[PDB]
């Protein structure tokens, strides 16, 4: 039986900038690094940036919408995105669903998130104002 | 300041076959769907399925080392793996690091992991065994 996420890999063209992005933009705690990759840690989350040399820098528009959210309190959230905002990050979407989120892009172009708000409150919001044919489980 | 994953987001081309996927064949709870996706959670993590018309169904080899790695026993381990060979899920690598690992692949091509261990277990194993240029960093 399956217990929750163990770990989230990420292919990167080039190995010291995107350490440099999730260390010192993302402030996560970098643990090891080596010729090819690096591991760093948010909270409970373990991160793998795995250096792949046909990563490619992909626009946008011609990714799909998988991505990555990170959580972030809601005190927190403004100065962070401001921040990253000045350090030249680029965004890939306006926020148009409930909790504050800031959509951005990591340099290889992965599709990331700052999110505040949890599961169980996505779905009271859903309870509230469902989704287009939407369809609820309980118990 | 990040506090760890908030969501995990995969774009899917059909999405009554993913979410059976997800929580038929991996076991996590659907706590809604809608005309365009779904929501369920495994532990910790809240996965939500996006139904994108952008998303291809993707071979392995077309794809980078991107992946998602999910938490399981080392009890359950072989077994569980054992049933998803059984039920046609293919298999995008052979395991090569500390700890049991099985690498399957989602309906679009999503590269997975069932993983047992931690990232302190990963760091202690690769202290006795460096990788190819590796350094530690205190705290
Ligand atoms: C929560 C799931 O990623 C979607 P959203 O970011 O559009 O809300
Ligand atoms: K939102
Ligand atoms: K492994
Ligand atoms: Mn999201
Ligand atoms: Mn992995
Ligand atoms: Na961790
Ligand atoms: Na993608
Ligand atoms: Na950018
Ligand atoms: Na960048
Ligand atoms: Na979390
Ligand atoms: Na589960
Ligand atoms: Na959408
Ligand atoms: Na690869
Ligand atoms: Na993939
Ligand atoms: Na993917």
Redesign the interface.
Known sequence: ???????????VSQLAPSVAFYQQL????????????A?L??????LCL?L?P???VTPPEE???????????EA?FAS?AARLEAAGVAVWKLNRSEGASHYFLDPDG?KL???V???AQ??AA?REQ????????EQ
């Not at 039986?1 to 292919?11: Q, Y």
């Open positions: 039986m399956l217990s929750g996420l163990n770990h989230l890999t990420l292919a993302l402030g996560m705690t970098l643990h090891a690094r080596w010729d090819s990759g591991y840690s948010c909270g409970d989350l373990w795995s792949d046909q990563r490619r990714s799909d919408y998988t991505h990555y959210a990170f959580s972030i309190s927190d962070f992965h998130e700052l999110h708000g949890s599961l996505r779905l859903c469902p989704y287009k044919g939407m369809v609820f489980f």
